[PDB]
Amino acid sequence: DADLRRLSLKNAKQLLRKFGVPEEEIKKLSRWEVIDVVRTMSTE
DNA sequence: TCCTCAGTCGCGATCGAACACTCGAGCCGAGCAGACGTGCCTACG
């Protein structure tokens, strides 16, 4: 979680692109929301 | 060049739900002494 916070908007965006997250969530460009989704995607 | 601002992480902090221990109330079985009767046997007329 702290590691995901360090990940920064640029690399978490690229990770959400890699997992196949839809472009709306990538688009909102909210780092805090993006990390919560990426943590959920990793948990899945 | 800034300049605070919104969304979220880690940790103490208390709180509700559950779980382990205790303790007595009550019932049940065993055990023992005894009474309330039937049958089975002897000293006295």
From Swiss-Prot:
This is Transcription initiation factor TFIID subunit 1. Signal peptide: none annotated. Phosphorylated by casein kinase II in vitro. The gene is TAF1. The TFIID basal transcription factor complex plays a major role in the initiation of RNA polymerase II (Pol II)-dependent transcription. TFIID recognizes and binds promoters with or without a TATA box via its subunit TBP, a TATA-box-binding protein, and promotes assembly of the pre-initiation complex (PIC). The TFIID complex consists of TBP and TBP-associated factors (TAFs), including TAF1, TAF2, TAF3, TAF4, TAF5, TAF6, TAF7, TAF8, TAF9, TAF10, TAF11, TAF12 and TAF13. TAF1 is the largest component and core scaffold of the TFIID complex, involved in nucleating complex assembly. It is linked to Dystonia 3, torsion, X-linked: An X-linked dystonia-parkinsonism disorder. Dystonia is defined by the presence of sustained involuntary muscle contractions, often leading to abnormal postures. DYT3 is characterized by severe progressive torsion dystonia followed by parkinsonism. It has a well-defined pathology of extensive neuronal loss and mosaic gliosis in the striatum (caudate nucleus and putamen) which appears to resemble that in Huntington disease. Intellectual developmental disorder, X-linked, syndromic 33: A syndrome characterized by intellectual deficit, delayed psychomotor development, delayed speech and language, and characteristic facial features. The Bromo domain mediates interaction with histones that have acetylated lysine residues at specific positions. The second domain also recognizes and binds histones that are butyrylated and crotonylated. Component of the TFIID basal transcription factor complex, composed of TATA-box-binding protein TBP, and a number of TBP-associated factors (TAFs), including TAF1, TAF2, TAF3, TAF4, TAF5, TAF6, TAF7, TAF8, TAF9, TAF10, TAF11, TAF12 and TAF13. Interacts with TAF7; the interaction is direct. TAF1, when part of the TFIID complex, interacts with C-terminus of TP53. It comes from the Eukaryota. It is found in: Nucleus. Belongs to the TAF1 family.
